[PDB]
């Protein structure tokens, strides 16, 4: 039907939304946690840096 096709294309809009927040929120949280863990990387390498400098 025409109403059925309108329902299906609204469902296409729904799924387009689903994938929209999917990719967008995914990369959002991913980048945030990646650079936060890069800061943590720097912190751990800093304590290791103290250890190496005292040893040598």
């Amino acid at each position: 039907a025409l109403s059925d096709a309108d329902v299906q294309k609204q469902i296409k809009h729904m799924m387009a939304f689903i994938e929209q927040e999917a990719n967008e929120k995914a990369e959002e949280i991913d980048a945030k946690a990646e650079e936060e863990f890069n800061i943590e990387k720097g912190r751990l390498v800093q304590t290791q840096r103290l250890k190496i400098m005292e040893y040598y």
Binding site: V7, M14, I18, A22, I29, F37, E40, L44, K51, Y55
Partner: protein, 57 residues
């Protein structure tokens, strides 16, 4: 129609939940992984400087 109104909600909420959970769990493992990696790298640096130590000895 009325069925979609709950299925799409289920999709959205479950996927947001698993993304958040994956972020948190990967962080939790990654801290110890980075400690291990830093120890590894530092031990290579120590071995290099120990080779240098014996050289200058």
């Amino acid at each position: 129609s009325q069925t979609q109104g709950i299925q799409q909600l289920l999709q959205a909420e479950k996927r947001a939940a698993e993304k958040v959970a994956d972020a948190r769990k990967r962080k939790a493992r990654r801290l110890k992984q980075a400690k291990e990696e830093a120890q590894m790298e530092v031990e290579q640096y120590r071995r290099e400087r120990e080779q240098e130590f014996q050289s200058k000895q």
